[PDB]
Amino acid sequence: FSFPFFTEAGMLGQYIGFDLDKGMIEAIEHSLRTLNAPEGIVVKQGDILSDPSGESDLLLMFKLYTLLDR
RNA sequence: GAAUACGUUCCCGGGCCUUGUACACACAGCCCUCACACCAUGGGAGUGGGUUGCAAAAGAAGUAGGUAGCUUAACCUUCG
Ligand SMILES: [Mg+2]
Ligand SMILES: [Mg+2]
Ligand SMILES: [Mg+2]
């Protein structure tokens, strides 16, 4: 829900955060219409101690910490 | 200068006693946080032999056996 403040500046591109807890991702992904969260943002599951492959521009690391160095 | 506690179940404080205790300066006891180094142990792709076992092949020296080639002083010579 950082989008209200990410777009307060004008980030409007594809923000897609990847968690693993599906009982938490689906307890927060239903919000798309229930809460009427902005319609310009996707979310998809994924880890990073296993899957850091792709290309993007900004790489938000919030709960990475040293769990990958664990 | 006088209207006059019917009553002690109640941590100003102590005695008698009991069970414990996560107790001995001596009373109370259920994590929120992490890459965690570095010496010791249990492992552990492959390397390598020791010592070699096993299926064999090949066999140096020596010892023994055979042996039509070859060679030779003692013996017998029939004297070839
Ligand atoms: Mg007392
Ligand atoms: Mg041997
Ligand atoms: Mg010989």
Return all residues near A6 (Cβ < 8 A) that are at least 6 apart. Answer: A15
Q: What is the C-alpha radius of gyration for chain A, rounded to an integer number of angstroms?
A: 13
Residue A17 CB: number of other CB atoms within 10 A?
A: 16
Q: Which nucleotide is nearest to A66 (CA to C1')?
A: B35
Confirm or deny that A48 is annotated as ligand binding. Answer: yes
To what resolution in angstroms was this structure determined? 3.0
Return all residues near A57 (Cβ < 8 A) that are at least 6 apart. Answer: none
Task: Give the integer Cα–Cα distance in Å for A11 and A19.
Answer: 21
Q: Concatenated DSSP letters for chain A?
A: --HHHHHHHT--S------S-HHHHHHHHTHHHHTT--TT-------SSS---S--S----SS-TTTS--
Answer whether A44's CB lies under 8 Å from A25's CB: no
Strand B close to A33 by CB, under 7 A: no
Long-range CB contacts (within 8 A, 24+) of A11-14: A12/A40, A14/A41, A14/A42
Gap from CA of A32 to ligand 1 centroid (Å) = 65
